Amino acid sequence: YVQAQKQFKQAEDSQNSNTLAKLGYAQCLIARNEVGDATIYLEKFFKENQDSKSSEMMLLLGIIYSQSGKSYYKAII
Amino acid sequence: RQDYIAKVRYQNDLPAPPCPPKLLKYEIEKEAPQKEFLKDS
């Protein structure tokens, strides 16, 4: 998980257009139980890329917000 | 005062507890299945 997350970060730094690398980075954050860190990274990516059609990213955001509970409105959206 | 007989008693009595049927949490409502589903390759 540490090595995979580092590799995903290096992939993102090499070419920022690789959305799959960032999604794998968030998945690795989830793997390391970094719920808050993954949430912050996902919010940063979504706010920078509000027009991106990453359906799985939005599904993961909704699941995270439902687990949080207070952010139900973003989860619905 | 010999007039009409009537008693006034406001009714604000609390009803008995309902004990409604309980919802069952989904499998994705538990932390471990959530972790397994999100960490899918």
The number of beta carbons lying within 10 Å of the beta carbon of residue A8 is 21
CA A26, chain centre distance (Å):
4
Give the separation between CA A69 and CA A63, rounded to whole angstroms: 10
Give start and end residues of each alpha helix (H) in B1-41: 31-38
Chain A residues touching residue B34 (CB < 8 angstroms): 63, 67
- Phi, psi dihedral angles at B9 (to 5 degrees): -140, 110
| Distance (Å) from the alpha carbon of B36 to chain A's nearest alpha carbon | 9
Return the SS3 of B22.
coil
Give the separation between CA B24 and CA A23, rounded to whole angstroms: 32
Dmax over CA atoms of chain A, in Å, equals 36
Per residue, what are the HEC states of A18-75? CHHHHHHHHHHHHHCCCHHHHHHHHHHHHHHCCCCCCHHHHHHHHHHHHHHCCCHHHH
Interchain proximity B34–A60, CB inside 8 Å:
no
Please list, in sequence order, all residues whose beta carbon lies within 8 angstroms of the beta carbon of residue A65, skipping any fewer than 6 positions away: A71, A72, A74, A75
Report how many Cβ contacts below 8 Å link chain A to chain B.
11
